[PDB]
Design an enzyme around this catalytic site. Structure first.
Site, PDB file in Angstrom:
ATOM      1  N   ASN A  35       2.835  -0.634  -8.707  1.00  0.00           N
ATOM      2  CA  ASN A  35       4.118  -0.411  -7.982  1.00  0.00           C
ATOM      3  C   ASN A  35       5.116  -1.529  -8.304  1.00  0.00           C
ATOM      4  OD1 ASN A  35       2.750   1.664  -6.647  1.00  0.00           O
ATOM      5  ND2 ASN A  35       2.068   0.237  -5.057  1.00  0.00           N
TER       6      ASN A  35
ATOM      7  N   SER B  25       1.796  -4.759  -6.431  1.00  0.00           N
ATOM      8  CA  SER B  25       0.559  -4.181  -5.847  1.00  0.00           C
ATOM      9  C   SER B  25       0.084  -3.079  -6.791  1.00  0.00           C
ATOM     10  CB  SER B  25       0.787  -3.656  -4.449  1.00  0.00           C
ATOM     11  OG  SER B  25       1.957  -2.854  -4.394  1.00  0.00           O
TER      12      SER B  25
ATOM     13  N   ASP C 283      -2.010   0.977  -6.840  1.00  0.00           N
ATOM     14  CA  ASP C 283      -2.490   2.197  -6.148  1.00  0.00           C
ATOM     15  C   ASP C 283      -3.791   2.661  -6.793  1.00  0.00           C
ATOM     16  OD1 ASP C 283      -0.447   2.278  -4.332  1.00  0.00           O
ATOM     17  OD2 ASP C 283       0.869   3.487  -5.633  1.00  0.00           O
TER      18      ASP C 283
ATOM     19  N   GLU D 144      -0.543  12.644  -5.851  1.00  0.00           N
ATOM     20  CA  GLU D 144      -0.940  11.206  -5.888  1.00  0.00           C
ATOM     21  C   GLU D 144      -1.664  10.857  -7.205  1.00  0.00           C
ATOM     22  OE1 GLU D 144       0.059   8.933  -3.900  1.00  0.00           O
ATOM     23  OE2 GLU D 144       0.852  10.186  -2.263  1.00  0.00           O
TER      24      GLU D 144
ATOM     25  N   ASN E 216      -2.923   1.618  -1.584  1.00  0.00           N
ATOM     26  CA  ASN E 216      -2.400   0.451  -2.356  1.00  0.00           C
ATOM     27  C   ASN E 216      -3.052  -0.859  -1.887  1.00  0.00           C
ATOM     28  OD1 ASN E 216      -0.979  -0.183   0.011  1.00  0.00           O
ATOM     29  ND2 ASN E 216       0.913  -0.706  -1.088  1.00  0.00           N
TER      30      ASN E 216
ATOM     31  N   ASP F 199       6.306  -3.589  -6.367  1.00  0.00           N
ATOM     32  CA  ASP F 199       5.894  -4.821  -5.626  1.00  0.00           C
ATOM     33  C   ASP F 199       5.020  -5.740  -6.491  1.00  0.00           C
ATOM     34  OD1 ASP F 199       5.274  -2.173  -4.212  1.00  0.00           O
ATOM     35  OD2 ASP F 199       5.963  -3.350  -2.482  1.00  0.00           O
TER      36      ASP F 199
END
Length: 129
Positions: free
Chosen positions: A46, A50, A52, A35, A59, A48
């Site tokens: 991301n 969004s 992280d 991660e 997220n 989208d």
């Protein structure tokens, strides 16, 4: 900050993630490594639009509020920056919450692809937990 395996492993266990909903500590030390690279201040966008955040890359679509994702649901009711501090209390509280929901640890796409079904104890081999 950036943790070493055992140093992380220790904190995670201390917070009560070792066998949280059946997932050995390894699964979580494993997740963190892929991660974020154990890196508390890791931030990645991301597809989208969004973002992280934190050692586990929770997220801002659902769980935290980064005040720039529109359609943000903010399920952990925590400013995303709270994810990015040296103490993982917020990350871990917001991780216990995510996994407890639907798809378990399948939520973390670098646990599905990188950790799931691998000699996962490896990631705690040679740490006095």
């Amino acid at each position: 900050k950036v943790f070493g395996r055992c140093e992380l492993a220790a904190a995670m266990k201390r917070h009560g993630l070792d066998n949280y909903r059946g997932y050995s500590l390894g699964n979580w030390v494993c997740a963190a490594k892929f991660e974020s690279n154990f890196n508390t201040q890791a931030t990645n966008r991301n597809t989208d639009g969004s973002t992280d955040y934190g050692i586990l890359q929770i997220n801002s679509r659902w769980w935290c509020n980064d005040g720039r994702t529109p359609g943000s649901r903010n399920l952990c009711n925590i400013p995303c920056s709270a994810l990015l501090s040296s103490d993982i209390t917020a990350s871990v509280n917001c991780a216990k919450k995510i996994v407890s929901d639907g798809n378990g640890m399948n939520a973390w796409v670098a646990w599905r692809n990188r950790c799931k079904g691998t000699d996962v104890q490896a990631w705690i081999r040679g740490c006095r937990l």
